[PDB]
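In response to a reviewer's request, we include the raw inputs and outputs for one of the modeled complexes. The two entities were modeled together in a single run.
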Amino acid sequence: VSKIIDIKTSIIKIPLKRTFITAVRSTNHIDSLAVELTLDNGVKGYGVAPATTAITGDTLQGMQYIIREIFAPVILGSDLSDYKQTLELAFKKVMFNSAAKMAIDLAYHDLLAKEQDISVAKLLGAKANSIVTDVSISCGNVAETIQNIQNGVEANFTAIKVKTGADFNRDIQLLKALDNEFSKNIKFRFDANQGWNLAQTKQFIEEINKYSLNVEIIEQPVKYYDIKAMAEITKFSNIPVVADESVFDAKDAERVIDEQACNMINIKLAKTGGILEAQKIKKLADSAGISCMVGCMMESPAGILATASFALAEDITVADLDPLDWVAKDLYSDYITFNEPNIILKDNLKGFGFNLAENLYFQS
Amino acid sequence: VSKIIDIKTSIIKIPLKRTFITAVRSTNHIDSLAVELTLDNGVKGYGVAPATTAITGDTLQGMQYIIREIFAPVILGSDLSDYKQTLELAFKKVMFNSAAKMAIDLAYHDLLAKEQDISVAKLLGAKANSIVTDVSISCGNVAETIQNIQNGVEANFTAIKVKTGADFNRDIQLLKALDNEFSKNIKFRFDANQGWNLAQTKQFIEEINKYSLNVEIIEQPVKYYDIKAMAEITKFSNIPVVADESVFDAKDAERVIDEQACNMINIKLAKTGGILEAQKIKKLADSAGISCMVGCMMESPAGILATASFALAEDITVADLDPLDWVAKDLYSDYITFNEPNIILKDNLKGFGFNLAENLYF
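The model returned the following structure tokens for the whole complex.
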């Protein structure tokens, strides 16, 4: 019987190699909070979550307070084997702030795996160690956008996630350029980040039909709450429609399933508040015959490893896991081999294998 | 034209006279963040919002960061007259954190009113100065609860909000005790804070009908997201059903209107992110023939004043505004006369009429 006797955090700031721009925001960096749980046997578990305030509403400052002043009193002194009960009772005290919850759920999984002397991926039941990711391309003018895609293709990515929804006229013009520049061995994924209205979405889909493109998904074309439009688009489209911001948790998944509002759900740990809730979504989706992909915020490689581990355990093969491509290799090379576009888990790691304490000063 | 050239924040904590406890939480104090906006003509304006993390997810520390580092760059240097656009631009950078938005929205309205040398209530179109509130009663054992109610009645409240949803057997037994101790001059409002399932809700409603009791509303009996159950309870019930946690913003209001999931919406500024979004809810409800009441978190008298101002401007007469009853009179006596159960705005205040001098400058 191991008990959690300490909880500490540290902020992590990472610079991006190039500017990330979506319909929602623009950034050159990632802000994350790491949490450390210490067992009474000295073993330490870790989780890392992004603060993407425009999407999940999380802030580093809110996460720190929640974890150290709200969750901590519930967790401290509790048995590791009571994790499900502990997380349920702790999470009930906080509405939203899903990324804060992600950090805690991940640290618990790290502990659970380490206590069994296995990786988290293995704990969750993964067989495979490799998942393929697209690379995503910032909003920008057509010329710049074609250049970024060529860079991705030269880097060995054949699945390309094209951000749209910032400028609809630009989005339409871009299709022409794509059709001219790339073959059908390149697979496109469009993600509007809610930036289109219903009419524009249908128009974009009709426009795709005018060219010869390999298009795999249309992701979150409209506002997260316009489930009626999502259903209409899903019925209209010959291309699978993906819900992202429309689905954070299991009850969101129930709603989109009930309303036939997508063909596929993009599961993200920063939205679900960690692995436990993501598992519940996957079960619901499976029962409903809805497929799942995994995705992320522009977030640290640690979140990517955790997400890859989950996907491998759940037989999820469609992934937008690209942040590794936006940051320095040394940030992930302790735990991941990225042979683009393949994210490969390194062998024989205990827990996730993040190796955070070496570079970060944790404080209670 | 006036431009906003400075933004400051301050944390304010206030003690409660007695313990507030619901199905949600238990507390002896209020945590608030206040924001001050300064125009380049010297006029300052203020808004104050609660951090009730279990409900809106807001934290003091989160609100502080959001206002200083996210909202401030958008607001600073902007024209006051552009406020609708400025707030739209600012709020699109932040999901949730509605109480942080409330603080900023209120400070803008304080400025707007002060620029016209009038109260915010007057700015919003209010004429009347007074609104009746219930008093709310903490969860407790039956005997405890009867005593708290008697205290309220003795204090002159005739509308009583009874918190339920923590212990269902207690809730059911309590009805017998109410029917025994009280006549129909006392009107009850039950708020389960989501604590009941569908079966329990129908049972409580049937139980009510076994007695002689004046029952005005049943509030948020089930989970905020179970709209199907809300719609079923609404159809089943002979008592008006109120959506609280099911409606934060206008798009939430559209959903409950579309699904016929309530008879009435409880509008709170801490959920709406301030007055502009609250006005949009009111317009939608009006169009759908859905009534509105106003409500609050357990929050500062400044928030209560802002909410009373909105209600008076919107012809909303049903209110659960009680926190004034939970704090020392000298906190609010400058801008409000609470002669129970009447919340009455003082004459000739400019803007809201509260200031931060003790917090910021002393």
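As requested, we also summarize the result in words. DSSP finds 13 helices and 13 strands in chain A. Residues 1-116 of chain A form a domain with the Enolase-like; domain 1 fold (CATH 3.30.390.10).
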